[PDB]
Amino acid sequence: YKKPKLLYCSNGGHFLRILPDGTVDGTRDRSDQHIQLQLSAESVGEVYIKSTETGQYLAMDTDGLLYGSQTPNEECLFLERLEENHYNTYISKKHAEKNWFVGLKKNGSCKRGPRTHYGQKAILFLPLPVSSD
């Protein structure tokens, strides 16, 4: 798909990637096959991140492991907001007690569950918007 928001994870510095099977990870370059993830707003803050083309819903599960659902469901339902100087943050509206964040492990893979929070850069995502969607 026509590449939208190049969500650079602030830890290590990979772009957020979502793979055919459903899973999610870090790829160092926006040029990758599968970085076309778009935030489908539920409302004035809350969003479902979908693979534009292949359709998988970027989801955080019951421990807090990151994956891709078939459907938009609360695991995929992120409260968005900008924290650092134009750096976005997708907080699980399901896990809204602990308030987990879909960050990446240094190497370029998903960071799981229940200490993803306001301390590491890992939670911060810098979008480079290529397409205006």
Give the gist of this structure.
This protein is mostly beta strands. 0% of the residues lie in helices and 35% in strands.
Topology:
Blueprint: E1 5-9, E2 15-18, E3 24-27, E4 37-41, E5 46-51, E6 57-60, E7 66-69, E8 77-79, E9 91-92, E10 104-105, E11 109-110, E12 125-129
Antiparallel strand pairs: 1-12, 2-3, 4-5, 5-8, 6-7, 8-9, 10-11
Keywords: Acetylation, Angiogenesis, Cytoplasm, Developmental protein, Differentiation, Growth factor, Heparin-binding, Mitogen, Nucleus, Phosphoprotein, Secreted
Binding site for heparin: 11
Pfam families: FGF
Description:
This protein has no helices and 12 strands. By secondary structure, it is mainly β. The chain has a 4-stranded antiparallel sheet, with no helix packed on it. The chain has a two-stranded antiparallel ribbon with strand order 1-12.
The gross shape turns out to be: globular
Main sheet makeup: 4 strands, antiparallel
Helix content: under 10%
**Domains, number:** 1
Regarding CATH, which class?
Answer: Mainly Beta
PDB class: hormone/growth factor
Keywords: fibroblast growth factor, protein-carbohydrate complex
Assembly: monomeric
Entry title: Solution structure of a biologically active human FGF-1 monomer, complexed to a hexasaccharide heparin-analogue
Brief descriptors of the model:
mainly beta, monomer, 133 residues, four-stranded antiparallel β-sheet, Trefoil (Acidic Fibroblast Growth Factor, subunit A), nucleus, two-stranded antiparallel sheet
